[PDB]
Amino acid sequence: SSFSFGGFTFKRTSGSSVKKEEEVLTGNLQTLKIRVHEGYEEFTMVGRRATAILRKATRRLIQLIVSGRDEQSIAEAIIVAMVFSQEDCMIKAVRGDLNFVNRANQRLNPMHQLLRHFQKDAKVLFQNWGIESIDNVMGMIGILPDMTPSTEMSLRGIRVSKM
């Protein structure tokens, strides 16, 4: 029930999915054969400096609650979750070709390609994801596309659990 992605251990806590291959065009008009997880799943994410609860459906982030020691540790977890979501807006936020390889010169898996692209610079990803008005929930806060806190708005589906 656990696996690694992007520096985080993911643990599925509920749900299930079936893989279906889909061929999409990235935002840079490159073909990419993604391995789409169809179904609704709940996960925890545990990294060195950040943790999260993630609920998602097929190519759709429903809820992400993130905790972390600072804005950029939090940002790291968000990037990973947005890529893992497989959302169309994330695919379309790509701005360069995906040709990443490991030290054996083997091409990274598609979801790794995407993660490595956004790990260059996540600004377009974050700007394109979507924002929403929020309610002022005790112990929680919004996070804006520039990774600063807000009590009025947040990235869509995403909240930060404060200390």
| 84 contacts 111 by C-beta, under 8 angstroms | yes
Task: Say which residue the tokens 């260059």 belong to.
Answer: 120
Long-range contacts of 103-110 (CB under 8 A, 24+ apart): 109/35, 110/32, 110/33, 110/34, 110/35
Method by which this entry was solved: X-ray
Cα 10 to the chain's mean position, in Å? 12
CA distance 81 to 55: 10
Experimental resolution (Å): 1.5
Q: What are 148's two structure tokens?
A: 């600063």
Strand-pair partners of 66: 52, 160
Nearest to 97 by CA among 27, 6, 21, 22: 27
Strands of the chain, DSSP E: 2-5, 8-15, 18-25, 31-38, 41-46, 50-57, 60-68, 131-133, 140-143, 149-150, 153-155, 158-161
Concatenate the DSSP letters of all residues of 117-153 into one string: HHHH--HHHHHHH-EEE----TTEEEE-TTS-EESSE
Nearest to 162 by CA among 135, 144, 142, 132: 142
- Residue 113, CA distances (Å) to 50, 60, 106, 157 in order: 22, 19, 12, 24
CA distance 148 to 140: 14
Q: What are 10's two structure tokens?
A: 């993911």
Decide: helix, strand or coil at residue 67: strand
| 82 contacts 94 by C-beta, under 8 angstroms | no
